[PDB]
């Protein structure tokens, strides 16, 4: 069966504590990215579309590593995010890159699509469309 997605507990951009296993019972779209990464930014508008879809049986979570490998500090990131026109996308602060390491992230953007019991259903390097994601989740429990 699917390998367990490594658990994490991270602070979000808006100050919430977010723990992956608290989402058991719901599917999860998990995206690792960075503000300096062009293909990452390219993918954000479509992810905002997806977030606006009301009938989702999955939650969207994205993860950056502030102050690490060129990423903005937590002091500067939220302002930068809003000034790009980005909205309605959760961003978690992987302060010690520990989550990136646990997911063996060696390239970005990378998406992990996780089923309702916390198992990894799909790993995608680079781009994945909304229809691609929706199709993958339709085959997961």
Residue numbers in the entry: 45 to 185
Passage from the reporting paper:
Attempts to obtain the reduced form of Etrx2 by co-crystallization with β-mercaptoethanol resulted in a new oxidized structure in which Etrx2 forms a complex with a 2-hydroxyethyl disulfide (HED) molecule. A different conformation of the β4–α3 loop was observed coupled with the presence of the HED molecule at the hydrophobic cavity. Etrx2 has an unprecedented hydrophobic cavity close to the active site. The presence of a hydrophobic patch near the active site has been associated with substrate recognition in other TDORs. The CXXC motif (81CGPC84) defines the active site. Many thioredoxin-like proteins share also a proline residue within the CXXC motif. This proline residue is also present in the CXXC motif of Etrx2, but not in Etrx1. The Etrx2 binding site presents a hydrophobic character while Etrx1 presents a highly basic character in this region.
In addition, the molecular interplay of the surface-exposed TlpA (renamed Etrx1) with its extracellular paralogue Etrx2 on oxidative stress resistance and virulence are unknown. The bioinformatic analysis of pneumococcal genomes identified two genes encoding surface-exposed thioredoxin-like lipoproteins, renamed here Etrx1 and Etrx2. According to the accepted catalytic mechanism of thioredoxin-like proteins, Etrx1/Etrx2 would bind their redox partner SpMsrAB2 by means of a hydrophobic surface and subsequently perform a nucleophilic attack on the target disulphide bond via the N-terminal nucleophilic thiolate of the CXXC motif (Cys84 in Etrx1, Cys81 in Etrx2). Surface-exposed Etrx1 and Etrx2 deliver electrons to the SpMsrAB2 protein for the reduction of MsrA2 (by Etrx1 or Etrx2) and MsrB2 (by Etrx2) domains.
